[PDB]
Amino acid sequence: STPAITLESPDIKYPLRLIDREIISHDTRRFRFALPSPQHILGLPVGQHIYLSARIDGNLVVRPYTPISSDDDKGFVDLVIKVYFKDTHPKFPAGGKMSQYLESMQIGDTIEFRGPSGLLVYQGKGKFAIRPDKKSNPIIRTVKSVGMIAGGTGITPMLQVIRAIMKDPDDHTVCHLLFANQTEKDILLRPELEELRNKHSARFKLWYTLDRAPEAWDYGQGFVNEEMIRDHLPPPEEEPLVLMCGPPPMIQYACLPNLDHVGHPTERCFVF
Ligand SMILES: Cc1cc2nc3c(=O)[nH]c(=O)nc-3n(C[C@H](O)[C@H](O)[C@H](O)COP(=O)(O)OP(=O)(O)OC[C@H]3O[C@@H](n4cnc5c(N)ncnc54)[C@H](O)[C@@H]3O)c2cc1C
Questions:
Q1: 3-class SS at 193?
Q2: Which residues are reported to carry the modification N6-acetyllysine?
Q3: Rounded Cα gap, residues 252 and 223, in angstroms
């Protein structure tokens, strides 16, 4: 109520105006959108995301994104987007629908936001409120540590939580992040993650892994396995929560079964 929220109902689409573009690398962008007034906030609880929706080439396309801005930000929302260009991966000649749609927007164009959405909310100081499904009440579990597995753009739901914890000097939850990508080129938001690690090392552990690592590389190599789970996530005996977001293949065949191997109950594993 104090600051006016933009996402007043989840059943409503809000056309937000694109006000700024930023080329980060060849295929990664930051887009900024104007909230309805400069004193609005988004209205997005930690742990949840929004959907963009648009009519692209005659079809309705809906996709989830987690902003890198937060409810402290007045007047705007920022998204970091990986663009899947056509005519690039000869085996995905068409590219990605939504990300190329965003790449093509001009300053002034609008796009429809809706939310908040998602089964998990972070309540602070270790309190996670997790719905078994969209229609049931949340179960509330209090952890002292959170393990996090992210592939590609899956980092933006981790970062939102990481930040939410580090802002709060009274939040002593320890976050352990294992970040998987294809090539060093593809470590999205590396400077942000490393600045946070520089300041908050006692509450933030960070480790990468790469499918095709360069010759000078100090971190993991290959897919997520038993050993990386043991070495870079809190142990199952600490009763940690474990969060996952990334390409469905990695989550389903690389993460979940090995999490089961090591001993993390599936009740303490959550996929965004
Ligand atoms: C909780 C959550 C948060 C998310 N946060 C973000 C975020 O912050 N930023 C973000 O950018 N995305 C985010 N996403 C992902 C986003 O929802 C989309 O999956 C992504 O934008 C791709 O959508 P698209 O329509 O463009 O691609 P699609 O049309 O769905 O593309 C189909 C698929 O083909 C493959 N593909 C196509 N072209 C290429 C190519 N050139 N190279 C390689 N593979 C290719 C990719 O696997 C691609 O996803 C998030 C998803 C979830 C669930």
A1: helix
A2: 13, 91
A3: 12
